[PDB]
Amino acid sequence: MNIFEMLRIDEGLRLKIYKDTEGYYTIGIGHLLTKSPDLNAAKSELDKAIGRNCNGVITKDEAEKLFNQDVDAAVRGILRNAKLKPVYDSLDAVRRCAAINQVFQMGETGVAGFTNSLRMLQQKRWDEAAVNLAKSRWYNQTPDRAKRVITTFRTGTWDAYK
């Protein structure tokens, strides 16, 4: 297991524009196209992302390319984030994957809400962190996925992903 296989499980792979769990146009392996309700706006974003006229459809190679860019951008974002970087750098490799997964899904706008979870993670208070992480819109809206990510943070093993 690695971050790619982990996010591939959590995000799936769809080659046609679909709506994510939040109702937003997405393609590939959880590549968010736009929060606009306008399918045409999503199609424009897709064509810009791929560099061709996709008419709402991409190849597996194209999805994996976007995924590579997206995973890279997630980690680089974490490393640029003054609140996230020290927590992330405190973690072992498996827990770092959980951090990448969480940011991939959630972005960074809600980092301040997770101040207490982040402190507990940096402190390596794993069960406490896991209890705190679950007290979230995140957990309640995507519980099965959040349970996996949280188990990963709690144990630093890949048990939740088999």
Radius of gyration of CA atoms, rounded to a whole number: 16 Å
How would you describe the shape? elongated
Q: Main sheet, how many strands, which sense, barrel?
A: 3 strands, antiparallel
CATH topology annotation: Lysozyme
> In which range does the helix fraction lie?
55-70%
How many DSSP H or I helices?
9
Please give the alpha-carbon distance between the first and last residues. Answer: 9 Å
Number of strands: 3
PDB class: hydrolase
Keywords: hydrolase, glycosidase, bacteriolytic enzyme, Antimicrobial
Assembly: monomeric
Entry title: 4-chloro-1h-pyrazole in complex with T4 lysozyme L99A/M102Q
Protein architecture, described:
It is classed as hydrolase. Keywords: hydrolase, glycosidase, bacteriolytic enzyme, Antimicrobial. With 162 residues, the chain is mainly alpha-helical. It has one domain: Lysozyme. Helices cover 60% and strands 7% of the residues. It has 9 helices and 3 strands; from the N terminus they run αβββαααααααα. It has a 3-stranded antiparallel beta sheet. The longest helix has 21 residues, at 60-80. It is elongated.
List the helices and strands and how they pair.
Elements: H1 3-11, E1 14-19, E2 25-28, E3 31-32, H2 39-50, H3 60-80, H4 84-90, H5 93-106, H6 115-122, H7 126-134, H8 137-141, H9 143-155
Antiparallel strand pairs: 1-2, 2-3
Helix pairs in contact: 3-5, 4-6, 5-9, 6-7, 7-9
PDB class: hydrolase
Keywords: hydrolase, glycosidase, bacteriolytic enzyme, Antimicrobial
Assembly: monomeric
